[model samples]
Target chain A: SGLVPRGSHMTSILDIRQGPKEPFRDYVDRFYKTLRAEQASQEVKNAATETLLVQNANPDCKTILKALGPAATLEEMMTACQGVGGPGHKARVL
Target chain B: ITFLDLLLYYGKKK
Candidate 1:
């Protein structure tokens, strides 16, 4: 959590710039990319991503995922996201 | 609003 904000690649993820056309699964993957790049845990990553992912997730899934506990597991949130929205939407929530 | 509160938030304390 004391990391130096994770260098330049950090900007790519930190900016919360998931492309408008980006799929839900890709967005989740990119979030993990940033988490791994930061070398931190769920709590640390959520501080940066909680609201962002909430806003980006499928509208149906967003409320539930956003309500998750701070240390929630990826599988838990992903499970909440499954079977939501159109096919492209919430795609690959697993 | 105390340091202790932060530790206990969402029942994080063990």
Candidate 2:
């Protein structure tokens, strides 16, 4: 018991996706948190995190993030995304 | 549940 299979964390991180009504900020926070727990080099971690954040975010949020361009840190990405339909956008319920 | 919780859940699934 309590044994974690190799690559499980990364696999799980990849499985995360933003809910339709979830805010981008919240999604990033959740993503970064999960990523932090992964056992990978900093370079790999940041790269994967950035890719997943952009890939899994809701359409509007994903567009905004891609427009902001590349960031070295998740904090920088989050800060850059704070404008436009970032944190203040209303979550669409479906 | 938090992301960590979910992570562990998936980890156990593997």
Candidate 3:
């Protein structure tokens, strides 16, 4: 399914507080489904995105407002890429 | 090296 193993880890983003008897496998699908439902109306637009640092690249990243948008760090990008069903971290350009 | 590598890296610390 991926170049990496498919598994879920305890993310600091949201807290469900379900205990050990409620293991990881039980939560992942629902976790993603929940985030995706929130994302259906999602659009990221900021004045900073209009800031042109280079001639062609207008969306020069200034700061991260949410874990859901253009990521400021590799970890946050993984969180974003989780919705795409992927390896989530940076990959070699093929 | 992986969770699949759990077959190897287990019982050892990285």
DockQ of each: 0.04, 0.04, 0.02
- Tell me, what's the RMSD of every candidate? 10.1, 10.6, 18.5
Ranking the candidates on TM-score from highest down gives: 2, 1, 3
Instruction: Give per-residue CA lDDT, model 2, range A1-94, as digits (tens).
Output: 1355655655467766887667656776667566777676666666565566678887876676667665433444455556542554676531
Off by over 4 Å in 2: A1-11, A71-94, B1-14
Q: What fraction of the native alpha-carbon contacts across the interface, defined at 8 angstroms, is recovered by model 2?
A: 0.00
Candidate 1 Cα misplacement greater than 4 A, ranges: A1-7, A14-23, A38-46, A66-72, A84-94, B1-14
DockQ of 1: 0.04
Query: Could you tell which candidate, 1 or 2, scores higher by TM-score?
Result: 2
Which residue pairs come into collision in candidate 1? none
Whole-model lDDT for model 1 versus the true structure?
Answer: 0.51
Across A1-94, the per-residue lDDT of candidate 3 in tens digits comes to: 2353533443221442223333322333343334333312223211211121111111212121132333233233223333422554567532
Model 3 sits at a Cα RMSD from the real structure of 18.5
